[PDB]
C-alpha cells in the first residue's frame, strides 16, 4: 500500500463539480464528473456524429492517437433521469492524478443536447460497485484496489461553495484532514453494491416530518441537489412554503434566510442544513425568486425509492467512502 493521490475539482456554480483525467499514450485529457451514483466510465468519441452538437462542444477521445488502445466495441447504453447516452466499449490506459490503470470505458457516439449542451464536463467516472455497472464492466475503483497501491481502500469528497479559490477535491486512498474538522462519524451501508445507507428521519425545524419510521438515503457525488420521492418532497416544500415551477422549487429571495433548518437523521446524529446551505441567494429582493437546491425524484426499484444526498449536502459534510469496511464517513467540511 502506502499510496494516496488527490485530484483537484472545478466548481461550476455549485451545480457541476468536475476534475481532470487522462486517457492514452500520449494522454488525452477530459473534464469529468466523479459519481458515486453510477459505476461506468465514459467520455465522448470521435465516432460521435457531428449531428450531436453536444459532441462538437466537448473534447473527444480518438482511439487512433493512443498506442495503448485495445478495441472491444461492444454496444453500451447508460440510462440517466434525463434520457440515455449510447456508445461502444473500448479499453485504454487511464490517469487519475498519480494513479494509472488499464480500464474498460464507453465511447459515447449518441450524446443528446438535453442535457449536455449545458454540461461543462465531458465525461463521468462511476465510483459505485460492479453490481451497478452496465455490462458487468469492472468499475475503476475496483481496478485501483486490484493494484494494491492505495493506503486504505477508500476515496473521499470535498465540495466547496462557489466564492470567486479551491472548487473541490476528490482524494483516492484516504481523506484530507485540512478540509474537515473533528473526527469522522461512520455509517455502515445497508448492503454491498450501492453507496446507500439507512436514514431514520427527515426533520423541519424541531418538528420531525418525514421518513419517520425509516427510509434509504443514497449518497450521490454526481447529484447537484438533494432529492427525495415526490410525496416526500411535496410535504417538505409545503412546510418550507416554496412554490413549484416546471422543474425546480423556489421561494422569494427575501424569505430565504428565515426559512427553517432541515435535519437529516443519520447514524444517531442529526445532520442539519440551514437556509444558507440549501438556498441560492442571488439577491435578497422581495421582487425576485430564489431557487432551492432540493427537488423531487422517484428513483425506481431496486435502488429506490430513496433520498439522494447530493452536492447540496456534501458541501457541508466531507464524505469518505469506505470500500474496505462498506461504510460511509461524514465530517464537518471546511
Ligand atoms: C453525472 C452525469 C450527468 C447526468 C445527467 C445530467 C447531467 C447534467 C448535465 F448534463 C448538464 C448540466 C447539469 C447536469 C446535472 O446537474 C449534474 C451535473 C454533474 N453532477 C455534479 O456535479 O454533481 C455534484 C443534473 C441535471 C438533471 C438533474 N440531476 C440529477 O438527477 C442528478 C443525477 C445525475 C446522474 N448521476 C446521479 C445523479 C442533476 C450530468
Ligand atoms: C469484449 O469483451 C468481452 C469480455 O466480457 C469479450 O467476450 C469479447 O471477446 C471482447 N471483444 C474484443 C474484441 O476484445
DSSP symbols for 183-242: --EEEE-SSTTSSEEEEEEEEETTEEEESSS-EEEEE-TT-SSEEE-HHHHHHHHHHHTP
Long-range contacts of 54-59 (CB under 8 A, 24+ apart): 54/111, 54/112, 54/113, 54/116, 54/117, 54/119, 55/108, 55/111, 57/117, 58/111, 58/116, 58/119, 58/122, 59/28, 59/29, 59/30, 59/31, 59/122
Q: Ligand 1 pocket, 94 CB below 6 A?
A: no
C-alpha–C-alpha distance, residues 161 and 293, integer Å: 13
C-alpha–C-alpha distance, residues 185 and 264, integer Å: 14
C-alpha–C-alpha distance, residues 190 and 326, integer Å: 9
Judgement on whether residues 182 and 156 belong to the same structural domain of the protein: no
C-alpha–C-alpha distance, residues 52 and 45, integer Å: 11
| Largest CA-CA distance found in the chain, in angstroms, rounded | 61
Contact 133, 77 (CB under 8 A): no
Closest of 302, 287, 293 to residue 273, by C-alpha: 293
Judgement on whether residues 71 and 139 belong to the same structural domain of the protein: yes
Judgement on whether residues 185 and 224 belong to the same structural domain of the protein: yes
Look up the domain containing 221 and give its range.
Answer: 176-333
SS3 label, residue 244: strand
Grid cell 458487468 is found at 136
**Final resolution, Å:** 2.9
Judgement on whether residues 269 and 133 belong to the same structural domain of the protein: no
Ligand 2, pocket residues at CB < 6 Å: 71-72, 74
- Residue finishing a domain among 131, 159, 175: 175
C-alpha–C-alpha distance, residues 251 and 244, integer Å: 9
Distance of CA 121 from the midpoint of ligand 1 (Å): 10
Judgement on whether residues 121 and 258 belong to the same structural domain of the protein: no
- Which cell numbers hold the place of 158? 470535498
Judgement on whether residues 184 and 145 belong to the same structural domain of the protein: no
Exposure of 302 in the CB half-sphere (CA atoms within 13 A): 7
Q: How many domains does the chain have?
A: 2
Distance of CA 275 from the midpoint of ligand 1 (Å): 22
Catalytic (active site) residue 92: no
Judgement on whether residues 88 and 138 belong to the same structural domain of the protein: yes
**What CATH number does the domain containing 185 carry?**
2.40.70.10
- Residue finishing a domain among 144, 159, 175: 175
Judgement on whether residues 141 and 182 belong to the same structural domain of the protein: no
Distance of CA 79 from the midpoint of ligand 2 (Å): 22
Beta bridge partners of 241: none
Give me the count of residues in the chain. Answer: 334
Judgement on whether residues 24 and 62 belong to the same structural domain of the protein: yes
Under DSSP, the state recorded for 146 is H
CA 108, chain centre distance (Å): 20
Judgement on whether residues 170 and 197 belong to the same structural domain of the protein: no
Judgement on whether residues 224 and 249 belong to the same structural domain of the protein: yes
Element (DSSP H or E) covering residue 116: helix 113-116
Q: After which residues is the chain broken (C to N over 2.5 A)?
A: 164
Q: Ligand 1 pocket, 80 CB below 6 A?
A: yes
Element (DSSP H or E) covering residue 314: helix 311-314
- Which cell numbers hold the place of 204? 423541519
- The residue annotated as part of the active site, out of 14, 92, 122, 220, is 220
Give the residue whose CA is nearest to atom 3 of ligand 2. Answer: 72
Judgement on whether residues 93 and 158 belong to the same structural domain of the protein: yes
Peptide bond into 325 cis (omega under 30): no
Grid cell 470505458 is found at 105
C-alpha–C-alpha distance, residues 258 and 205, integer Å: 11
- Which cell numbers hold the place of 260? 427553517
First and final C-alpha spacing in the chain: 28
Beta bridge partners of 16: 12
Burial letters 224-247, b for 16+ CB under 10 A, else e = bbbbbbeebbeebbebbebeeeee
- Which cell numbers hold the place of 105? 470505458
- Which cell numbers hold the place of 24? 492514452
Beta bridge partners of 264: 202, 271
- Residue finishing a domain among 113, 140, 175: 175
Amino acid at each position: 500500500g502506502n499510496t494516496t493521490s488527490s485530484v483537484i475539482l472545478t466548481n461550476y456554480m455549485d451545480t457541476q463539480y468536475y476534475g481532470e483525467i487522462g486517457i492514452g499514450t500520449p494522454p488525452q485529457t477530459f473534464k469529468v464528473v466523479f459519481d458515486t451514483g453510477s459505476s461506468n466510465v465514459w467520455v465522448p468519441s470521435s465516432k460521435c456524429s457531428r449531428l450531436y452538437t453536444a459532441c462538437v462542444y466537448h473534447k473527444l477521445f480518438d482511439a487512433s492517437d493512443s498506442s495503448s488502445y485495445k478495441h472491444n466495441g461492444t454496444e453500451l447504453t447508460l440510462r440517466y433521469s434525463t434520457g440515455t447516452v449510447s456508445g461502444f466499449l473500448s479499453q485504454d490506459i487511464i490517469t487519475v492524478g498519480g494513479i494509472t490503470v488499464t480500464q474498460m470505458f464507453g465511447e459515447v457516439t449518441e450524446m443528446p443536447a438535453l442535457p449536455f449542451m449545458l454540461a461543462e464536463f465531458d465525461g463521468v467516472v462511476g465510483m459505485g460497485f460492479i453490481e451497478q455497472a452496465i455490462g458487468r464492466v469492472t468499475p475503476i475503483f475496483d481496478n485501483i484496489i486490484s493494484q494494491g497501491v492505495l493506503k486504505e481502500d477508500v476515496f473521499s469528497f470535498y465540495y466547496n461553495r462557489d466564492s470567486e479559490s479551491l472548487g473541490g477535491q476528490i482524494v483516492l486512498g484516504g481523506s484530507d484532514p485540512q478540509h474537515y474538522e473533528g473526527n469522522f462519524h461512520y455509517i455502515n451501508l445497508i448492503k454491498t453494491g450501492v453507496w446507500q445507507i439507512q436514514m431514520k428521519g427527515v426533520s423541519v425545524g424541531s418538528s420531525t416530518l418525514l421518513c419517520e419510521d425509516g427510509c434509504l438515503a443514497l449518497v450521490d457525488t454526481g447529484a447537484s441537489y438533494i432529492s427525495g420521492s415526490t410525496s416526500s418532497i411535496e410535504k417538505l416544500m409545503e412546510a418550507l412554503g416554496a412554490k413549484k415551477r416546471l422543474f425546480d422549487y423556489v421561494v422569494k429571495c427575501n424569505e430565504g434566510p428565515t426559512l427553517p433548518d432541515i435535519s437529516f437523521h443519520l447514524g444517531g446524529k442529526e445532520y442539519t442544513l440551514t437556509s444558507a446551505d440549501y438556498v441560492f441567494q442571488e439577491s435578497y429582493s422581495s421582487k425576485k425568486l430564489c431557487t432551492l437546491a432540493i427537488h423531487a425524484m422517484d428513483i425506481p426499484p431496486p435502488t429506490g425509492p430513496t433520498w439522494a444526498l447530493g452536492a447540496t449536502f456534501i458541501r457541508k459534510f466531507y464524505t469518505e467512502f469506505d470500500r474496505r469496511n462498506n461504510r460511509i464517513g461524514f465530517a464537518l467540511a471546511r
